[PDB]
Ligand SMILES: [Cl-]
């Protein structure tokens with residue numbers, strides 16, 4: 672779950688930029 | 702040591718938030 | 732390519748600090 | 762999900778945008 | 783150590799707090 | 804390259820500096 676927890680951190684980071692004002696949603700669910 | 706070096710970066714990041722004013726200590730030792 | 736994409740993010744981060752005003756170049760090429 | 766999708770394969774800026782509001 | 787402990791298993795906010803001053 | 808060089812082995816501050824302008 673760690674490698675996946677590390678990856679997600681970057682995902683959110685990248686969503687913040689890409690989406691900008693649009694905002695975004697992050698759902699770690701399976 | 703890389704995957705571990707990557708992980709630690711996130712650890713420190715997470716300690717900074719959790720601990721807040723308390724501050725924190727990071728010891729990479731074995 | 733993911734583990735490598737994760738690693739690079741940290742590389743750039745570390746280049747920014749080390750090099751400072753010098754600036755730096757990042758080339759993901761093989 | 763984004764994880765299963767973006768942690769096994771590098772998602773592009775356009776694949777990432779699918780997770781925008 | 784935190785590494786051996788938090789890089790093999792996802793430490794929770796409470797496990798992380800054990801490393802606070 | 805820095806990747807092949809710094810993602811298989813922890814590059815030191817001095818190895819990193821080789822990638823500075
Ligand atoms: Cl990472």
Ligand SMILES: [Zn+2]
Nearest residue numbers: 677707711737
């Ligand atoms: Zn990372």
